[PDB]
């Protein structure tokens, strides 16, 4: 996509990195966010977003950073994205305007930025020259994840044997095998707030060959009352001149994994 804009479109994009030990202990995690504004209507040029009253805009752990054209002090005191110069206007050319960034970082053992926890266990197998692997995952997301991709860095000769009534998603299937990348297994759904195991057998020389495992998920929502993973949200859009005059808009809240791995 390059999603459709009916005037003013607000996008809240978050990206999550996360490294775990094999057993499941969080080693690190980093979350980067941005809020962007696309406007394609010169009548909406003189708008002002206002963020949800539930966000602490002074919380230093988010490292909030307003773009320079934006007025940092009304943001900090009022939770209001507005122009530095009251007489000017946002470009109405449908370009993505970055108006606010954030970056949050958790130390070891801190699971506050983790939308999907992971554990792995390996034991040598009977049925293949390799290992029986179990990947246990728990989601803490309000929505579901669709087509989550675990990927194991080996390109076995014998096909991967997905233990099928031991796994939560029974259409769990290998979808890619590559000499470089390894083997990728898709999982159709991980539903909101639920636990799960992907269990399978794979040929490998030794445990170390199976790491790092990597996972890839991604999620979206065009709902107007949707909070991002960290809580970011838009309470309303409003005229620069008259703060009582509401303005029409859609908002897209997304979350992607980037480097999300067990090591």
């Amino acid at each position: 996509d390059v999603p459709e804009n009916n005037g003013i479109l607000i996008s809240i994009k978050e990206v999550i990195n996360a490294e775990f030990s094999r057993d499941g202990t969080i080693h690190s995690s980093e979350l980067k966010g941005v809020l962007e504004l696309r406007i394609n209507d010169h009548d909406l040029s003189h708008s002002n977003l206002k963020l949800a009253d539930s966000i602490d805009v002074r919380d230093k752990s988010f490292q909030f950073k307003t773009h320079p054209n934006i007025d940092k002090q009304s943001f900090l005191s009022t939770k209001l994205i507005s122009l530095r110069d009251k007489s000017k206007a946002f470009p109405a050319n449908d370009q993505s305007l970055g108006v606010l960034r954030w970056r949050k970082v958790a130390p070891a053992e801190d699971d506050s930025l983790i939308p999907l926890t992971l554990t792995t266990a390996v034991s040598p197998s009977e049925s293949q020259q390799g290992f029986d692997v179990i990947i246990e995952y728990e989601s803490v997301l309000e929505t579901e994840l669709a087509d989550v991709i675990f990927t194991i860095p080996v390109f076995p000769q014998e096909p991967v044997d997905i233990n099928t009534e031991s796994s939560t998603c029974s259409d769990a299937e290998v979808v890619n095998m590559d000499q470089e990348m390894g083997t990728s297994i898709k999982i159709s759904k991980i539903a909101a707030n639920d636990a799960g195991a992907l269990a399978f057998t794979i040929e490998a020389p030794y445990e170390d060959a199976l790491y790092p495992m990597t996972v890839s998920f991604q999620e979206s929502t065009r709902d107007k009352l949707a909070k991002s993973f960290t809580g970011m949200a838009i309470q309303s859009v409003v005229m620069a001149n008259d703060h009582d005059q509401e303005l029409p808009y859609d908002v897209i809240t997304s979350l992607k994994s980037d480097e999300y791995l067990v090591q």
Binding site: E36, H67, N69, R84, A89
Partner: peptide, 9 residues
């Protein structure tokens, strides 16, 4: 760059 855009008017 989403982070370079100019105020208009």
């Amino acid at each position: 760059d989403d982070w370079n855009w100019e105020m208009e008017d």
